[PDB]
A paper describes a structure:
[name] plays a critical role in establishing a baseline level of B-cell inhibition, and thus is a critical determinant of homeostasis in humoral immunity. The extracellular domain (ECD) of [name] is comprised of seven immunoglobulin (Ig) domains (d1–d7) and 12 putative N-linked glycosylation sites.
Our 2.0 Å resolution structure of unliganded epratuzumab Fab indicates that its paratope is largely pre-configured for binding its antigenic site (r.m.s.d. of 0.50 Å). Consequently, we next characterized the antigenic surface of [name] recognized by two leading therapeutic antibodies in clinical trials: epratuzumab and pinatuzumab.
Author numbering:
A (entry chain L): 1 to 27, 27A, 27B, 27C, 27D, 27E, 27F, 28 to 94, ...
B (entry chain H): 2 to 52, 52A, 53 to 82, 82A, 82B, 82C, 83 to 99, 101 to 113, ...
Amino acid sequence: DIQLTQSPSSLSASVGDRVTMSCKSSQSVLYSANHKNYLAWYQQKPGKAPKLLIYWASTRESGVPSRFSGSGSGTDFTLTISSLQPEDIATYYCHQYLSSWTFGGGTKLEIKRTVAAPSVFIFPPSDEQLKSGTASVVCLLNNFYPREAKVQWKVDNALQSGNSQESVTEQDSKDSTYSLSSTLTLSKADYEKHKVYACEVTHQGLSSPVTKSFNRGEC
Amino acid sequence: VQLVQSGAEVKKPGSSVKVSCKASGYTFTSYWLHWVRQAPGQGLEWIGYINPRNDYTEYNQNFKDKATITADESTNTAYMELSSLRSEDTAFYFCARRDITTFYWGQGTTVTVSSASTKGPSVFPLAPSSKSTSGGTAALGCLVKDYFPEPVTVSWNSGALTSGVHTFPAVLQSSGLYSLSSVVTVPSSSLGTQTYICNVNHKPSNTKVDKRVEPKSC
């Protein structure tokens, strides 16, 4: 029914910045009986329930830091964070409760920092896994910013597809970097069929792609 | 004055699940109780609500053939039941109520729908070497592979080592089994002159493994 549009979908800002995000409703959420705007703002950390920041568009929750404030009336609302702090890395949601509940799409907020190239590490499969009949090669990208990075696996210079999987940590609260871990998995017989195992890493902090590589049998 | 939801659920496709939301510290029939879904990496989606005073219910159109919300004033407990579970039902489920002064959300309940069955992981070393060294920094870790369901917990040196330890989010493999890596950033000088042990626990399979990670010379 009443749709909510949040913008931007993502925000990057330095600690201490003033930050604003907007929420616009398809219809007015200002109720005629009490002249109250049925709009709330939430902060949500991963794996956790959303935490209420603002209710009735402008009333701040009791325990919430005074750096958070809400403004607007009718169909256009704004959440402002006066001085961005490192603990504010989260996804922010607007929520209208005038009619049946609807939510904005969220604003993912991250800390902006100096570009940092990843340290690239590679781990050959262990003797224990090989005894079991499989070989996993792990490529590690440590403490880089920004989050966008490309990891390509190459076996004897052949690009690999459909045999690897990666995961990225949440942004670190101390140095505002990300880390990424990628596992390439082959059967032991297929692993023993090739010599060079390499992960090629592309990142804004790298003037050229970096390759971490090893030869089967060398470790 | 809090809403307490039942624990994590792992279900096979085709089964049903009923999650509970206990309300305490207020009058249970005085406020509508809502349910909200959040699929992994996605936003918040309203499921429906119940008026516990007269058992009146309304649902999001998208959940009409999936969710049934009930309540019991006599036990001050609300329920949300999901029928004929499928993989797309894997999500976070919250109960939430609105007061005059504030909102109260439950802590959330994960529902994981998978055909896979319980399995303990193998813990393989991620051996440090020149291939995992840069300057005065070396990386080592443990690969915790092929387990179900979540979660696994990893400590290093029985909890005595926390600096430079980061555990990555698990990845769901095509087999339907999770895999996770836990790594540690250490001074390169400590390789060979410091013992590193990863302690892996998977309680669903009663798996407990302590793996020494020893350096390789390459």
